Design a protein around this ligand. Structure first.
Ligand SMILES: *Cc1cc2c(cc1C)nc1c(=O)[nH]c(=O)nc-1n2C[C@H](O)[C@H](O)[C@H](O)COP(=O)(O)OP(=O)(O)OC[C@H]1O[C@@H](n2cnc3c(N)ncnc32)[C@H](O)[C@@H]1O
Ligand SMILES: C/C=C/CC/C=C/CC/C=C/CCCCCCC(=O)OC[C@H](COP(=O)(O)OCCN)OC(=O)CCCCCCC/C=C/C/C=C/CCC
Ligand code: HEM
Ligand SMILES: O=C(Nc1cccc(-c2ccccc2)c1)c1ccccc1C(F)(F)F
Ligand code: SF4
Ligand code: F3S
Ligand code: FES
Lengths: 138, 239, 102, 613
């Protein structure tokens, strides 16, 4: 019996059986690395959705970009509420950017120990908040 | 008397239409060894022998008793019970695995994946074997430390979200580290073709560096690191 | 007996480091030339990224194929929509610049 | 019986055991082109031999100049002249070839300056036939030499079309008219019953350490092949010989390697005095396991204990360089800290002599063929082989040498393969078995599965373990041994009374552990009765009544003109034990040790002498 034959039989056995899947996301220990892997996907997705919405509306919707901005000025939000929208854009970008660099450092082979993860994790987290406040204020 | 509560996952396939549930046991810790396995053994021997789990060495070097204790995957024989009586130890089988009965997961696929990478020495001219000890320098041998110690407990792969969603086509941290183990054994001659065996989007390239595997390893090993080390060889090996 | 799986992976990191360099590059040097290179680097990286989310979660025969096609369409539509914006409007750079001091 | 699915498998050969010996035998058979099945109640990696730590002996002469014949002398001395020299010749000659075979397989042996396999000093070994000081021939993968041995043998095992019946509990031998036909087994996975038949059958089921309350051995060390051979009416050998390893941890009784001592580790009593200098002057704490442990046990007797309750002794390590402990003993460094909260680099480990090895087992040829005893003579059981710890070629005798069982495994596993390959052919007539063979195994299985009695399986196991522990320990006396016997027999009477709870088919551990209990008892009975009958002190068996080593001659004085003692008057002979499965009666006989080697001209016989270290 071969390794390929064993798997093919494993799946034949279990799928046709009344065996239950042991709980996973329901019971496994929450960690910062975990949350940060999740957030990288989330921010990654949100950003592409925003980029594609910007490209698609540029093809599908009428009027130039100024005509679209002049429409935002219409329901003139308070200077702080405009800063909120501005912070809500930069936040996911900055998180994904900094955590992105971390991902890249990893691919070089560097910084892959449990202490280095928790450390570099907080450095990313802190760097997000600072650069997000710092950019929104420009 | 110091009474500690254990909440344990239960399922009996030989019982008509039984569904998975939790059962709680209570143990006097003065009359019980320090490790979780000791409890399991005690509640098995004294309270309930319908409890069914894998175990052998009680030494943390066989890898049989691997399970999910209080969130993380470890070995029950190496994990001491948290003497804090206000907390209740929750014991589950290895996450996202087909449960045979109680805490006994079907590891058939796990081992088959291990087989598919050929965890043995491969020489281009094996017509001289069994007569001369091969020369490996002390420095060439250090390169295998943190790699050979693996016990195949399947804790890491079972703590791995990619191995949950894609356990069929993706080999997982456990098996992958052993592929690496043989890649850098200086005595091996099949290094290029060992890397070519991973040239598809699933076998190796399904890890997105969650590092949750390394954090969980009961033996202190770092499968995560070794995977990223594989990836680098994959991008760089010529011909 | 090609080695595409590893090449593709490298490609991703090459455009990752590219995209990283391109953000400050665009701030310091905002121009037409940056508007397009930013549009290419952005959609490609995004395309490959979502492609990973797809290959991770989309379990299926004719599904895996379909999602990958619908992603390709969305990606292509995006790159054009952006290039249209760079040609016939103020472009990615100046548009952000206007949006910010508002 | 309308309840149990009977599934018949056909093979050339069956190996029962996926340990070190099991595997080498298993894939060795497949390599010779045999359709082989391997039946094992654990996944092969989980088998004890992973717990192995010290090393595997081969006279590779890597550290100094060595000769395999010196290794020969050492083991036979070690064996206390109960070891059959023909087998010891074969093993020690094959030693280097077998160890090289393993390294060539990819076993990650630790290396030296030369780049060769690292060998270390160990208890009981010498150069120049004893006259040349301490020998360095213990080949080792750091502190985890067994783990690696088992994992590479398993790695290799995957190259051949061997059929691995993973997690199948072997119940009995298939026996027809003195000949072996295979094994009947329970498949734990679904409660089904499989009759695997073959021309040749190899038993490699390891030891029975779980007969005692304190052991280094795993929870699965329950002498299952031993019980199977017993239930067939076949004899077992030297079962009273139970190795008490000197350095087992005080807590859970986990093994701490003898390698510790070979690296420079010292044994210390309550007053700090290096007590092993007092017992063995020349060899110190690197003396034989039986001597060291009995010295330890005797140091506790006098009042020199070391705990807050004075019941153990310290193994000191902190004087050795930190980097030496890191590279040589990293695995016990971890388990000393985990189980005893001990930093090896600063504090000593609490160690106590505990049960470890079974030199007794299934009597065997140097070729690995199970021997029965007819008319005071040896006789080969057709189609039945045994190797590893479950066997007894008595390559170990009255006291096993340290780091010789991993060798035992590899050599005799291979030997079993060659004995089959060189006697019969693949695709030869596989002998047809009776339509209802192994019936009583299923009936036995059935009673235990629905066993509604008064004494729980776990409780009786405890009664057996504590009894063997206090009645047949390091030291033993006639009276104490006798109460042990009449106690174990009473506990065998208790077996008809046991309560079992789980009534399921799938993974009935409640059930298997009861099968294990029948297996354990049958092993224990023969251990204790044979122990009581042996009225001499030889190797690990130490009688406080008869402290004398009783041979055919008084080997202390000249051999010249002396009266040779008749066979039933001296004790330099193997104990052969039987038990009537029903009444639980142990009856015993004796067969001579083999003194002649395979070639006097190449390897000279070593006659008995005064044996002290
Ligand atoms: C206990 C111990 C022994 C030991 C050691 C460390 C420890 C903690 N270190 C050693 C060392 O460094 N050097 C050395 O030479 N020896 C050392 N030892 C002793 C040695 O390890 C043992 O004697 C040896 O491991 C015995 O191996 P064996 O080949 O006989 O197989 P096993 O490891 O004992 O495993 C038993 C196999 O048989 C199968 N089995 C058992 N019962 C059944 C039944 N019921 N049905 C089907 N299969 C069965 C098991 O599955 C297992 O595969
Ligand atoms: C496709 C993108 C779709 C547009 C959606 C808007 C997204 C907001 C952009 C992110 C914020 C960047 C920081 C803002 C900024 O620097 O503006 C000021 C500056 C003006 O000062 P100045 O007058 O030039 O003075 C500077 C003196 N040299 O602006 C610049 O100079 C050029 C900014 C270049 C930044 C690159 C944008 C990256 C796009 C990713 C968006 C992700 C989608 C969500
Ligand atoms: C322009 C805005 C960006 C968008 C729309 C975007 C989009 C995405 C998406 C959809 C993913 C896939 C998510 C996943 O697989 O988990 C991803 C991953 C990634 N991103 Fe971005 N990203 C952007 C900016 C950046 C920047 C500036 C960097 C540079 C540090 C970066 C580095 C990475 C890396 C290295 C990954 C892959 C990590 C891995 O799974 O191994 N991204 N991105
Ligand atoms: O699904 C992913 N994690 C995931 C998704 C949902 C829940 C959990 C989780 C939550 C708590 C504990 C453990 C795991 C984890 C994930 C996230 C980022 C990148 C790649 C992945 C994956 F590879 F596809 F697996
Ligand atoms: S690397 Fe660690 S968690 Fe993974 S199989 Fe080996 S011991 Fe288990
Ligand atoms: S999903 Fe597993 S492999 Fe390590 S890189 Fe990944 S945690
Ligand atoms: S049972 Fe041996 S690892 Fe826990």
């Amino acid at each position: 019996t071969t390794a390929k034959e064993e798997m093919e039989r494993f799946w034949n056995k279990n799928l046709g059986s009344n065996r239950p899947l042991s709980p996973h996301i329901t019971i496994y220990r929450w960690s910062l690395p975990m949350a940060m892997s999740i957030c990288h996907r989330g921010t990654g997705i949100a950003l592409s959705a925003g980029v594609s919405l910007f490209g698609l509306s540029a093809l599908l919707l009428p009027g130039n970009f100024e005509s679209h901005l002049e429409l935002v000025k219409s329901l003139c939000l308070g200077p702080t509420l405009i800063y909120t929208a501005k912070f809500g854009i930069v936040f996911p970008l900055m998180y994904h950017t900094w955590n992105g660099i971390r991902h890249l450092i990893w691919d070089l082979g560097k910084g892959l120990t449990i202490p280095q993860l928790t450390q570099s994790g907080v450095v990313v987290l802190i760097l997000t908040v600072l650069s997000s406040v710092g950019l929104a204020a420009m | 008397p110091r009474i500690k509560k254990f909440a344990i996952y239960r399922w009996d396939p030989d019982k008509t239409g039984d569904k998975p549930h939790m059962q709680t046991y209570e143990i006097d810790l003065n009359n019980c060894g320090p490790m979780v396995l000791d409890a399991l053994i005690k509640i098995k021997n004294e309270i309930d022998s319908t409890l069914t789990f894998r175990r052998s060495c009680r030494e943390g070097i066989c890898g049989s008793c691997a399970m999910n204790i209080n969130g993380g995957n470890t070995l029950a024989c190496t994990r001491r019970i948290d003497t804090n009586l206000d907390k209740v130890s929750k014991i589950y089988p290895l996450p996202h695995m087909y449960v045979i009965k109680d805490l006994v997961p079907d590891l058939s696929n796990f081992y088959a994946q291990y087989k598919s990478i050929e965890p043995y020495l491969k020489k281009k001219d094996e017509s001289q074997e069994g007569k001369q000890q091969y020369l490996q320098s002390i420095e060439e041998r250090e390169k295998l430390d943190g790699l050979y110690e693996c016990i195949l407990c399947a804790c890491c792969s079972t703590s791995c979200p990619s191995y949950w969603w894609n356990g069929d086509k993706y080999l997982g941290p456990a098996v992958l580290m052993q592929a690496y183990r043989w890649m850098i054994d200086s005595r091996d001659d099949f290094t290029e073709e060992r890397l070519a065996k991973l040239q598809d989007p699933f076998s190796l390239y399904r890890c997105h560096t969650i590092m949750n595997c390394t954090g969980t390893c009961p033996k202190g090993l770092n499968p995560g690191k070794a995977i990223a080390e594989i990836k680098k060889m994959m991008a760089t090996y010529k011909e | 007996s090609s080695k595409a799986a590893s090449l593709h992976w490298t490609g991703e990191r090459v455009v990752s480091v590219l995209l990283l360099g391109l953000l400050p590059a665009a701030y310091l040097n905002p121009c037409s030339a940056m508007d397009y290179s930013l549009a290419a680097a952005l959609t490609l990286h995004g395309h490959w990224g979502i492609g990973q989310v797809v290959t991770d979660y989309v379990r299926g025969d004719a599904l895996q194929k379909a999602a990958k096609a619908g992603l390709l369409a969305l990606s292509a539509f995006t790159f054009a929509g952006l290039c249209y914006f760079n040609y016939h409007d103020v472009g990615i750079c100046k548009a952000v610049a206007m949006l910010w001091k508002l | 019986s309308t309840q149990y699915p009977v599934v018949d498998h056909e093979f050339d050969a069956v190996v029962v055991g996926a340990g070190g010996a099991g595997l080498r035998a298993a894939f060795g058979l497949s390599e010779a082109g045999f359709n082989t099945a391997c039946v094992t109640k654990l996944f092969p990696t989980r088998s004890h031999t992973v717990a192995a730590q010290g090393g595997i002996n081969a006279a590779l002469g890597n550290m100094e100049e060595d000769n395999w014949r010196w290794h020969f002398y050492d083991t036979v001395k070690g064996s206390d002249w109960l070891g059959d020299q023909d087998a010891i010749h074969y093993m020690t000659e094959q030693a280097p070839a077998s160890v090289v075979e393993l390294e060539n397989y990819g076993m990650p042996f630790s290396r030296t300056e030369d780049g060769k396999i690292y060998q270390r000093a160990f208890g009981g070994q010498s150069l120049k036939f004893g006259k040349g000081g301490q020998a360095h021939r213990c080949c080792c993968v750091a502190d985890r030499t067994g783990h690696s041995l088992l994992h590479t043998l398993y790695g290799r095992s995957l190259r051949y079309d061997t059929s691995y019946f993973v997690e199948y509990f072997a119940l009995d031998l298939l026996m027809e008219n003195g000949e072996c036909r295979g094994v009947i087994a329970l498949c734990i996975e679904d409660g089904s019953i499989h009759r695997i038949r073959a021309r040749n059958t190899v038993v490699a089921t390891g030891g029975y350490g779980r007969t005692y309350f304190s052991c280094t051995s795993a929870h699965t060390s329950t002498g299952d092949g031993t019980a199977m051979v017993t239930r067939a009416g076949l004899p077992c050998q030297d079962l009273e010989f139970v190795q008490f390893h000197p350095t087992g941890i005080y807590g859970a009784g986990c093994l701490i390697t003898e390698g510790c001592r070979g690296e420079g580790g010292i044994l210390i009593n309550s007053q700090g005095e290096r007590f092993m200098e007092r017992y063995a002057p020349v060899a110190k704490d690197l003396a034989s396991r039986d001597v060291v442990s009995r010295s330890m046990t005797l140091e506790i007797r006098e009042g020199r204990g070391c705990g807050p309750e004075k019941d153990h002794v310290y193994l000191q390590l902190h004087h050795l360089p930190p980097e030496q402990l890191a590279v040589r003993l990293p695995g016990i460094s971890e388990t000393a800290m985990i189980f005893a909260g001990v930093d090896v680099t600063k504090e000593p480990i609490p160690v106590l002599p505990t049960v470890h090895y079974n030199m007794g087992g299934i009597p065997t040829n140097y070729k690995g063929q199970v021997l029965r005893h007819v008319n005071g003579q040896d006789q080969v059981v057709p189609g039945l082989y045994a190797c590893g710890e479950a066997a007894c070629a008595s390559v170990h005798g009255a006291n096993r040498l340290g780091a010789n069982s991993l060798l035992d495994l590899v050599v005799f596993g291979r030997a079993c393969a060659l004995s089959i390959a060189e006697s019969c052919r693949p695709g030869d007539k596989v002998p047809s078995i009776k339509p209802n063979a192994g019936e009583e195994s299923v009936m036995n299985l059935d009673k235990l599965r629905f066993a509604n009695g008064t004494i729980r399986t776990s409780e009786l196991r405890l009664s057996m373990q504590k009894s063997m522990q206090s009645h047949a320990a390091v030291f033993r006396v006639g009276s104490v041994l006798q109460e042990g016997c009449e106690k174990i027999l009473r506990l065998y009477g208790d077996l008809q009374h046991l309560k079992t709870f789980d009534r399921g088919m799938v993974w009935n551990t409640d059930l298997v552990e009861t099968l294990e209990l029948q297996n354990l008892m049958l092993c224990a009975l023969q251990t204790i009765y044979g122990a009581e009958a042996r009225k001499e002190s030889r190797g690990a068996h130490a009688r406080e009544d008869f402290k004398e080593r009783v041979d055919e001659y008084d080997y202390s004085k000249p051999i010249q003109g002396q009266q040779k003692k008749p066979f039933q008057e001296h004790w330099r002979k193997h104990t052969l034990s039987y038990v009537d499965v029903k009444t639980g009666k142990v009856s015993l006989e004796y067969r001579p040790v083999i003194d002649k080697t395979l070639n006097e001209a190449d390897c000279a016989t070593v006659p008995p002498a005064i044996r002290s270290y």
